[PDB]
Design a binder for these strands. Structure first.
Lengths: 67, 313, 142, 100, 191, 228
RNA sequence: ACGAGACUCUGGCAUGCUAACUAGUUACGCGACCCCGGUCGGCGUAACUUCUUAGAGGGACAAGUGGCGUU
């Protein structure tokens, strides 16, 4: 199974909340954005956070989110 | 006024097409760089089944190649890729003469000079690097530059006012002089990050496009903003027709063309192949280039194809 | 004048077979001897399989010299038959127009994928408490 | 003269840092220098039982010790070699200089 | 010039799979036709990927058993080649047509599974899968040839050849036909 | 040199030398709060830095004891005369060293004190020294014939993975009392710092931080100004 | 807060980057044999990293599409 833990979800949620205008639907673009605007020690965590940011962008584009 | 009609697609890529370039020297050649590591040189056939065929694949990069420009003699090529290096290709053998080294982040855009001696390059880092023909930097500005990512850098077409325009994500589009290599005019007032700028071939007015969908026009000789018109979706690519007084934009999944004499839309180049009604997202255009005669327009999509368009009337 | 030469390798488990395609008349030799004199002879069809699949007209402008070192026997045969196809594909792809590379590559993939793509299967490390990678010693009760 | 400098250590980061410092000194002194040749590493494996007695499940320990070795050649007299090796040395890196 | 893929010396076309329920579990016609029954593998990774394996390769894979023959694929390949040569030299027919007919006639179509607690004897008849029919046919033919060639002067390359000949006619002199009919009778006894 | 043993045996003998040296000093300097040695190699010179707590007491009067330690190292390990010089220095943040606090708790239990009182005192000293969290385990025949163990866990203590190697510091000590042997298990989790003096450099793998963006101005009117 | 996860080592690839007489490849010359070319882990020196070795980086994240699911 591929279920994101609470650290990835909280990091992606505060990334969506705090830096919203400089984002997009491309995984590599917001991957580089999350590389530069935060400090992630590893790379798998960076890729998982960027993927959840992309999914949250696709969710915001349809409507509001209660987080 | 007129109508823009498609003629075909160029199949053979595997990623999103990032840059398209053509030259007056070879009207039957389209040189395109995609998301994949190869750069495909197309040979035009004008057939009923396929418009063009690939002629030579240019490899040597290790990541996403983003920009490519062809030199004035029609035998050289310059590519900016994310690996942080630039390559000076040969169109006769497929080899690389010199490799540019010095960038530390992903490279966004490169450009040849008008006299084909100077190289400018904007990258993810906050530096703009001036190179020679032989891969050696002359003077790279790093301290007084963009505060974040640099999207596009372009030259003047004329040497009477040899400036270079530079747009980046910091909502500050700038003008640098070629001689003393310093800022001359900075321009403010654009909401959202920038994607591209394009210089008209007469070297008088420039067009700017970013996130908000406003195609903002400026001037090269004086730093006065001309006007601002809406484009709808996010503007990715911009170009000027060489002979006709036009300006074309890539606004999401559609291409908008306007008349620059009287400000009105000429045509709406939407996705006329309406087939993705099964809860889908339309593919977007990331690159487009006019021809040398302003007759055939080629656009780069995210559906692994390059569409061609021709003027009927 | 200019000299045309490519040099492509190929692996299955640990064997590395590196071919060499240059200009000349049609001859294929691995380790200094032709393809017919390679043991085991029961895999001679596996050896000659890309040549029989692509025809002798495509190989007539090249000659092929493969050096192979490492592995066993079957892995060496598969490495050679992968490396010959990869070297011909790279030679066509470099100097000939790549449309002809596409009608080579599509039928090569359509027959079998291992002619151009290596098999990523390695040996699993042995663990303590058992004779092999996954098997364990016999447990005794009472 | 054919001067060979051998560096053997256990850590990899301090070894790479001191090798970068030596090749930077060789580049700024403007003399012909060979590149950092990377010899294959050696691992020292000792496998032993965990329990001191003979009771319990048969569990074993796996110890390793990676050893990294580099060698860089120079073309200079000896005093330049000593004055460039006796600058900013690291405690965990051995340096060893001979002449053929 | 690959007009057709000759299986050593045998044509891969003009063969008929009579049973319509086994049209996509017998990979011999026009797609999965190779010169040799030896491939790289990677068929036992997914859940139904073994159905696309050729039937002669599956026969060579299931031929080697009983400890002392594990891993020896080349010997099973040459025994299968000699068996095909003997079948063609005896019946005057294509060896692939005899092998395909031996698969169909030796496959059971109804099986009784054991139900109840651990110790009691009680069966319940169910029908079988088309893949399991092929697997039982290959296993029965292979173990029949292996049991026929044991402590005997008759070699296994002609013991396997006479195994497929008798199974293709349903003459009930083979082990596989007899075990198929035994399974059918036990399933039919308590439906 | 004619012998010149192999590169494996060189590192082996060097490790044996450091292990025997560290054992010799942790047996001898149990009074002044010994922490560890640091053998640094120099051309034709060896010097071994000693990090302790009471650096005035390791030397003695006019450096007598350090001279005797140099002499016994030279006469035991087979070194040339005058090639060995020992150096003693004090280390800051005594509460962040596991061995020093274990030796302090051993001295407090050996002089005669309540075990819970000494454990509470050393834990309060460690968290007053600026730690992330610690635990102290004392196992033995604590007031009775049957042995027991008391565990004092508060704060933050990781247990698994690679970051248990360079965030916590583990020291095991034995106390010889009149009734038996008492063990000491102390573990101090060092805090994260970019300086490199208090603890390690790399953060926790699950820890992530974002930087505050500036307050950018949104112009409602397109403007263009010239400078330079 | 701990455990899990996160972390560390190894395997799987990059014809791109950094360098190899204690690892090689390709050209050239000499030498041996056969009938004009082939073989040589025979000898030696003009480039290079395709094999090998090992450092920094890259790459995979359920990213894209179609169904099921409070969507």
């Amino acid at each position: 199974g591929r279920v994101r833990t609470k650290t990835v979800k909280k990091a992606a949620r505060v990334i969506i909340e705090k830096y919203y205008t400089r984002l997009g639907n491309d995984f590599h673009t917001n991957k580089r954005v999350c590389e530069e605007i935060a400090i992630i020690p590893s790379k798998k965590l960076r890729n998982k956070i960027a993927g959840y940011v992309t999914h949250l962008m696709k969710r915001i584009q349809r409507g509001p989110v209660r987080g | 006024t007129e109508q823009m009609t498609l003629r075909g697609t160029l199949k053979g890529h595997n990623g999103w097409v990032t840059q398209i370039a053509t030259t007056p020297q070879f009207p039957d050649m389209i040189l395109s760089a995609s998301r994949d590591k190869t750069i495909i040189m197309w040979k035009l056939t004008r057939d009923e089944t396929n418009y063009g065929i690939p002629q030579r694949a240019l490899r040597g990069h290790s990541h996403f190649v983003s920009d490519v420009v062809i030199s004035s003699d029609g035998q050289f090529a310059l590519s900016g890729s994310w690996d942080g290096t630039l390559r000076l290709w040969d169109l006769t053998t497929g080899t690389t003469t010199r490799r540019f080294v010095g960038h530390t982040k992903d490279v966004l855009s490169v450009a040849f000079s008008s006299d084909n001696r100077q190289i400018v390059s904007g990258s993810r880092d906050k530096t703009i690097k001036l190179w020679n023909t032989l891969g050696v930097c002359k003077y790279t500005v790093q301290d007084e530059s963009h505060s974040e990512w640099v999207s596009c850098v372009r030259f003047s077409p004329n040497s009477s006012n040899p400036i270079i325009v530079s747009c980046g994500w910091d909502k500050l589009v700038k003008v640098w002089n070629l001689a003393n290599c310093k800022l001359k005019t900075n321009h403010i007032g654009h909401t959202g990050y920038l994607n591209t700028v394009t210089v008209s071939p007469d070297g008088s007015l420039c067009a700017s496009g970013g996130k908000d969908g406003q195609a903002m026009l400026w001037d090269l000789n004086e730093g006065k903003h001309l006007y601002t018109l809406d484009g709808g979706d996010i503007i990715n690519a911009l170009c000027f027709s060489p002979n006709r007084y036009w300006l074309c934009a890539a606004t999401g999944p559609s291409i908008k063309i306007w008349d620059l004499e009287g400000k009105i839309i000429v045509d709406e180049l939407k996705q006329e192949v309406i087939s993705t009604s099964s809860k889908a997202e339309p593919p977007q255009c990331t690159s487009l280039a006019w021809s040398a005669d302003g007759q055939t327009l080629f656009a780069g999509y995210t559906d692994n194809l390059v569409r061609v368009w021709q003027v009927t009337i | 004048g200019p000299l045309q030469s490519v040099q492509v390798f190929g692996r299955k488990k640990t064997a590395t077979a590196v071919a060499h395609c240059k200009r000349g008349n049609g001859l294929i030799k691995v380790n200094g001897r032709p393809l017919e004199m390679i043991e085991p002879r029961t895999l001679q069809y596996k050896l000659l399989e890309p040549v029989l699949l692509l025809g002798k007209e495509r190989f007539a402008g090249v000659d092929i010299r493969v050096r192979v070192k490492g592995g066993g026997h079957v892995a060496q045969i598969y490495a050679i038959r992968q490396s010959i196809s990869k070297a011909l594909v790279a030679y066509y792809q470099k100097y000939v127009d790549e449309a002809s590379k596409k009608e080579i590559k599509d039928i090569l993939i359509q027959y079998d994928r291992t002619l151009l793509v290596a098999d990523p299967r390695r040996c699993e490390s042995k663990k303590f408490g058992g004779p092999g990678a996954r098997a364990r010693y016999q447990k005794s009760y009472r | 003269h054919r001067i060979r400098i051998t560096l053997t250590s256990r850590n990899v980061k301090s070894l790479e840092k001191v090798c970068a410092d030596l090749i930077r000194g060789a580049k700024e002194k403007n003399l012909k220098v060979k590149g950092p040749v990377r010899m294959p590493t050696k691992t020292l494996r000792i496998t032993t039982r965990k329990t001191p007695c003979g009771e319990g499940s048969k569990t074993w320990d796996r110890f390793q010790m990676r050893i990294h070795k580099r060698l860089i050649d120079l073309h200079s007299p000896s005093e330049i070699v000593k004055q460039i090796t006796s600058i900013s040395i690291e405690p965990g890196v051995e340096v060893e200089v001979t002449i053929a | 010039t690959p007009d057709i893929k000759l299986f050593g010396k045998w044509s891969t076309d003009d063969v008929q799979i009579n049973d319509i329920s086994l049209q996509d579990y017998i990979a011999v016609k026009e797609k999965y036709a190779k010169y040799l029954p030896h491939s790289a593998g990677r068929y036992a990774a997914k859940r139904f990927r073994k159905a696309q394996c050729p039937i002669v390769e599956r026969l060579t894979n299931s031929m080697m058993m009983h400890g002392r023959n594990n891993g020896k694929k080349l010997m099973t390949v040459r025994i299968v080649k000699h068996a095909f040569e003997i079948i063609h030299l005896l019946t005057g027919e294509n060896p692939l047509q005899v092998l395909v007919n031996a698969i169909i006639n030796s496959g059971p179509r109804e099986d009784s599974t054991r139900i109840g607690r651990a110790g009691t004897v009680r069966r319940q008849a169910v029908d079988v899968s088309p893949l399991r029919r092929v697997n039982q046919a290959i296993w029965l033919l292979c173990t029949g040839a292996r049991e026929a060639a044991f402590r005997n002067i008759k070699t296994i390359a002609e013991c396997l050849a006479d195994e497929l000949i008798n199974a293709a006619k349903g003459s009930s002199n083979s082990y596989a036909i007899k075990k198929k009919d035994e399974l059918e009778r036990v399933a039919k006894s308590n439906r | 040199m004619a012998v010149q043993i192999s590169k494996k045996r060189k590192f082996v003998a060097d490790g044996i030398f450091k292990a025997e040296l560290n054992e010799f000093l942790t047996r001898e300097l149990a009074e002044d709060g010994y922490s560890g040695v640091e053998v640094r190699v120099t051309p034709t010179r060896t010097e071994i830095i000693i990090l302790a707590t009471r650096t005035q007491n390791v030397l003695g009067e006019k450096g007598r004891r350090i001279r005797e330690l140099t002499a016994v190292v030279q006469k035991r390990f087979g070194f040339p005369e005058g090639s060995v010089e020992l150096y003693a220095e004090k280390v800051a943040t005594r509460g962040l060293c596991a061995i020093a606090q274990a030796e302090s708790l051993r001295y407090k239990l050996l002089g005669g004190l309540a075990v819970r009182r000494a454990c509470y005192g050393v834990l309060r000293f460690i968290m007053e020294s600026g730690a992330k969290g610690c635990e102290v385990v004392v196992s033995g025949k604590l007031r009775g014939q049957r042995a027991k163990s008391m565990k004092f866990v508060d704060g933050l203590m990781i247990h698994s993975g690679d970051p248990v190697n360079y965030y916590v510091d583990t020291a095991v000590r034995h106390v010889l009392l009149r009734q038996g042997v008492l063990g000491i298990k102390v573990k101090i989790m060092l805090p994260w710092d970019p300086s490199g003096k208090i603890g390690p450099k790399k953060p926790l793998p699950d820890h992530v931080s974002i930087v505050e963006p500036k307050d950018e101005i949104l112009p409602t009117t397109p403007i263009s100004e010239q400078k330079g």
